[PDB]
Amino acid sequence: MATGKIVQVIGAVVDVEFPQDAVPRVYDALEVQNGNERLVLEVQQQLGGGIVRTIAMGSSDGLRRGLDVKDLEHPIEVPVGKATLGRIMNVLGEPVDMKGEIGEEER
Amino acid sequence: NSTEISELIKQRIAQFNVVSEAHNEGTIVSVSDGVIRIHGLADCMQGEMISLPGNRYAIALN
Amino acid sequence: EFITVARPYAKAAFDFAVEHQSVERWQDMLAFAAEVTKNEQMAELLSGALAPETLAESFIAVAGEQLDENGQNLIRVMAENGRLNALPDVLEQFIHLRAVSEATAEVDVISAAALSEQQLAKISAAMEKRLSRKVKLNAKIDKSVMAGVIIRAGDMVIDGSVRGRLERLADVL
Numbered sequence: 001m002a003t004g005k006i007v008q009v010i011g012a013v014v015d016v017e018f019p020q021d022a023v024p025r026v027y028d029a030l031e032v033q034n035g036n037e038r039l040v041l042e043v044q045q046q047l048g049g050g051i052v053r054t055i056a057m058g059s060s061d062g063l064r065r066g067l068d069v070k071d072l073e074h075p076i077e078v079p080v081g082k083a084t085l086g087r088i089m090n091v092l093g094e095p096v097d098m099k100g101e102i103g104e105e106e107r
Numbered sequence: 108n109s110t111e112i113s114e115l116i117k118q119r120i121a122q123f124n125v126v127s128e129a130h131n132e133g134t135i136v137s138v139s140d141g142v143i144r145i146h147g148l149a150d151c152m153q154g155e156m157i158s159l160p161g162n163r164y165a166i167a168l169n
Numbered sequence: 170e171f172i173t174v175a176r177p178y179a180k181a182a183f184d185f186a187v188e189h190q191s192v193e194r195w196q197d198m199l200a201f202a203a204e205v206t207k208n209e210q211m212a213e214l215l216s217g218a219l220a221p222e223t224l225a226e227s228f229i230a231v232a233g234e235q236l237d238e239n240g241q242n243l244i245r246v247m248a249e250n251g252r253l254n255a256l257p258d259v260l261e262q263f264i265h266l267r268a269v270s271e272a273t274a275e276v277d278v279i280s281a282a283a284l285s286e287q288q289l290a291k292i293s294a295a296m297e298k299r300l301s302r303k304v305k306l307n308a309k310i311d312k313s314v315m316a317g318v319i320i321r322a323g324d325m326v327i328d329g330s331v332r333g334r335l336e337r338l339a340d341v342l
């Protein structure tokens with residue numbers, strides 16, 4: 001399920017409000033469907049009641065207010081080990097070299 | 108009605124059990140960049156040591 | 170101080186109450202809502218960082234004296250913006266807008282000693298010509314003045330106290 005909703009978008013800074021039982025922690029990763037695409041947000045500050053200020057790890061365009069946001073209950077976490085040798089990856093550990101999935105055991 | 112009003116307020120507040128902190132206690136309402144805002148602690152004193160969950164301390168400055 | 174942020178809510182509530190003829194019910198509703206804001210246990214809650222809709226719904230519960238649709242809707246709108254503490258001022262500006270619309274005034278008369286109840290009639294009659302409004306006196310007794318009378322009507326005063334005369338003469342010299 002997706003417990004949060006976007007309440008502001010100002011450039012790259014997105015505010016999301018959750019029910020006060022389930023506010024993400026700091027540096028947690030959220031996830032939202034930016035149209036026909038996926039966008040992850042990193043929580044920077046827990047400010048006020050249920051609301052959380054985040055940085056978008058991608059282009060912010062196309063974001064509406066009110067979209068459903070889902071919190072991955074863990075920080076951004078990337079593949080590691082021998083599987084990554086010879087690959088190119090972005091900050092999120094996704095391959096940007098078109099050679100397909102990484103094949104990692106552990107994150 | 109001036110006084111029975113206040114009595115009805117106190118009664119209905121006890122009914123719906125909205126309640127105030129203990130004086131030596133409070134709840135975190137914000138977290139940011141290394142600072143927290145706490146709500147309550149009516150008897151916190153400037154410079155005191157506040158004990159967090161996980162056996163850690165915060166220093167009351169504001 | 171909430172004098173400036175209260176103005177919109179006061180005007181909106183008064184317009185609404187006027188359309189539906191219930192001005193006298195709205196004033197009671199606002200009086201009670203302002204009274205629940207002064208409570209020791211609630212004024213603690215209002216300061217917390219609760220979400221607006223939760224604060225409203227926990228505030229609405231403490232008042233069954235509110236006409237369920239509109240009187241509660243005002244609370245909800247105010248809670249959205251975080252202004253529930255402005256109620257004790259929305260009330261006073263509602264009373265003022267009412268007094269304006271019903272062309273009524275309330276003038277204080279400060280005297281060294283009570284007046285003859287025939288003097289008061291003349292003062293009130295004269296003020297009702299000074300003002301378009303129907304006046305309501307609330308005389309008082311003060312020993313600093315020692316003769317004459319102070320008439321204070323809103324923020325306009327007419328000073329005929331001997332005290333004022335003395336301290337206005339002293340400056341002529």
